[PDB]
Every structure is written in structure tokens, then in C-alpha cells.
Amino acid sequence: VTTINLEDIKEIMHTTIRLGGKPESGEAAELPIFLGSSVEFEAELYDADGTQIGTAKGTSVIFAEADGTVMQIVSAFDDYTDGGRVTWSGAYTMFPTDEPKSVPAQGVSGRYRGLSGTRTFQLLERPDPGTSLVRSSLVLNG
Amino acid sequence: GSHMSTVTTINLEDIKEIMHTTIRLGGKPESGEAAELPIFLGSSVEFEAELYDADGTQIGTAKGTSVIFAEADGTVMQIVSAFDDYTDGGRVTWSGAYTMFPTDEPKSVPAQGVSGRYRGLSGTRTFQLLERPDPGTSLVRSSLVLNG
């Protein structure tokens, strides 16, 4: 039974962050709609020795649940030079912002195809709105 | 990179989807840590749906969440994270971002077979809003194409 286990991924994430808010014009202004704050990102992925192992790209958007829990939804994927492509997506709690977060992941190509598991990501440093340092990990099996 | 081999095909067309929705307006956070931050809660939909073939036989269920946001030029988008569970015992995840408007044209995001006969296949999940027979319900025409 195959198990894949990437720990201590260094993830350098180039972020485009958008405030959102009430639409002002267009069809959306005539509908009950708020635009959520969003992050569009591209990232380089490195192993714990600093060797690049791949890249990532995705989008996350802020929303809230009935109980008042502020959430983020993300849809993203990794490309691993060695392993292949791994999609990942789900909703996770926004707060606290410095704890590790995880959503389900699916391997879809290369040696990762047909395995599924969990993609993890923890914000270490956000020095400016353009780049974040993330500590990441991936487990797949099947 | 993604998978280009298309040795095996699964093509599900003309799925009739009865979608039950929980709609939240969103807006500015009113309490807590989020309120001190410059953020907006996107309008969101949490949904569960029964999936039928064209004969009225249930072929599965779907569950997910979608949220409205916008691109830099102001184009309104939705992001969705979801999955189908089919009656033959497999799951297909699907997620991505698509342009909101017009709300009546077919939309689609990438899809991944994760278990059952779908495992290891990849492709596209499509969905088209046909009508809203009441504020809690959407009737959707859907299709799923997977290969690998």
C-alpha cells in the first residue's frame, strides 16, 4: 500500500490580495452579493534542504458559517517535478491565522496518481502583501 | 503537469441535479478578531444535491461550498470546492473558480476521481443552473467527463 509523506516543505508564496466588498456596478450590484476578500497565489516549493521540488498555484476566499466562524475556502494544486500534480481544496477556519491548516488532496498525475490524502500549510511570516513564508506538508496514500 | 493519457473514459451526460442550498449574504464581520481586520465575508452557498440520470434514477449525491469574489478588473467570480458520491461506490472531487455571469450558462471546474471506478481519472465537472423553483432549491443540468 503506497504512502507518500512530504514534511517540512518550504513554500514561498507570491500573493495577490484583494479586499472585496459591495459591488458598485454590473449585474452583481442588483443582487444580494458581497465579494469576499481573496488571495490569488503562486508558490515555489522546496524540501527541507532548500532544493526546489515544485510549485503551487491557487485561490482562497474568506466567508463565514452560520455560527459566526470565519472560514476560508481554497482551490489549488501542486506540481512536483518528481511526483506529479496534486490538487487540493476545501474550507478551513481562518483563526487563529498562525496554526497549521489542512484540506483534502488528490494526486492526479505521475507517481502520485490515484492516491489521496491531506495538504497542510501554516503561515510563518507575512512581511508584506506580496509574499508569504509558509511551512507545508503533504500526505497521500492508497 | 496534469495527466494527458486518456486510455479509460467515463462520460456522464445529462445529469439532473436537485440542489438544496443554504445561502449567506456575508459582508463586513461584526464581531471578534475578523472585525478589526480589513476583510469582507463573501456571499456563500453550502449545498447538498441528489443526482439523477435522465430516467429519474438516483445515481449519486453532491456536497460542497461556493463563495463569490472578484478578479482585479472587477469580474465577478465564484470559487467552489465539492465532491460527487456515486451509487456505485466511488467519489469524484471537483473545485475551481469560474466567472459568475451570466448565471444561466454552463460553468465548469476540474474534477478528480478519488475512489471506486473513478480513481486516478481526471477531467471536468460541468454544471448549469436551469431554474430556482423556490429560494432554497436550484435545478441544475450537470455532466462529468473523466479520463486517465
At residue A68, what is the residue type? G
- Are A126 and A14 in contact, with CB atoms under 8 Å apart? no
Contact A109 B122 (CB under 8 A): yes
How many residues in total does chain B contain? 148
- Are A58 and A76 in contact, with CB atoms under 8 Å apart? yes
Number of C-beta neighbours around residue B88 at 10 A: 10
How far off is chain B from A46, nearest CA to CA, in Å? 17
- Are A53 and A9 in contact, with CB atoms under 8 Å apart? yes
- Are B127 and B110 in contact, with CB atoms under 8 Å apart? no
- Taken in order of first residue, the domains within chain A and their CATH numbers are 3-141 (2.40.480.10)
Closest A-chain CA to B93: A106
Contact A73 B93 (CB under 8 A): no
Q: Which of A35, A79, A91 sits opposite B40 (nearest CB)?
A: A35
> Could you tell me which of A130, A136, A118 has the C-alpha nearest to residue A56?
A136
- Are B27 and B34 in contact, with CB atoms under 8 Å apart? no
> Could you tell me which of A93, A91, A40, A81 has the C-alpha nearest to residue B82?
A91
Technique behind the model = X-ray
In angstroms, the CA A73 to CA A27 distance is 24
Q: Which of A37, A65, A73 sits opposite B40 (nearest CB)?
A: A37
- Are A106 and A116 in contact, with CB atoms under 8 Å apart? yes
- Are A71 and A47 in contact, with CB atoms under 8 Å apart? no
In angstroms, the CA B124 to CA B42 distance is 25
In angstroms, the CA A74 to CA A134 distance is 15
> Could you tell me which of B46, B116, B91 has the C-alpha nearest to residue A91?
B46
In angstroms, the CA A58 to CA A50 distance is 22
Helix (H, G, I), strand (E, B) or coil at A29: helix
Contact A38 B69 (CB under 8 A): yes
Torsion of CA B111, B114, B120, B122, to 10 degrees: 0
Contact B119 A108 (CB under 8 A): no
- Are B111 and B146 in contact, with CB atoms under 8 Å apart? yes
Contact B41 A34 (CB under 8 A): yes
> Could you tell me which of A121, A104, A138, A94 has the C-alpha nearest to residue A12?
A121
In angstroms, the CA B77 to CA B54 distance is 30
Closest B-chain CA to A103: B81
Torsion of CA A105, A107, A112, A114, to 10 degrees: 110
What single DSSP character describes residue A70? E
Contact B1 A142 (CB under 8 A): no
How far off is chain B from A10, nearest CA to CA, in Å? 20
How far off is chain A from B56, nearest CA to CA, in Å? 30
Distances (CA, A) of B8 to A114, B15, B22, B114, B146: 14, 20, 36, 15, 8
Q: Which of B40, B42, B81 sits opposite A90 (nearest CB)?
A: B81
Q: Which of B26, B79, B120 sits opposite A73 (nearest CB)?
A: B79
How many residues in total does chain A contain? 142
In angstroms, the CA B110 to CA B126 distance is 9
Contact B40 A61 (CB under 8 A): no
How far off is chain A from B80, nearest CA to CA, in Å? 8
Contact B2 A108 (CB under 8 A): yes
DSSP labels, chain B: ------SSEEEEEEEEEEEEEEEE--BS--SHHHHTSS--BPPEEEEEEEEE-TTS-EEEEEEEEEEEEE-TT--EEEEEEEEEEETTS-EEEEEEEEE--STTS-EEEEEEE-SGGGTT-EEEEEEEEEEEEETTEEEEEEEEEEE-
Coarse DSSP helix, strand, coil percentages of chain A, rounded to the nearest 5 percent: 5, 65, 30
> Could you tell me which of B66, B65, B55, B57 has the C-alpha nearest to residue B86?
B57
* Structure-block grid coordinates of residue A24: 458598485
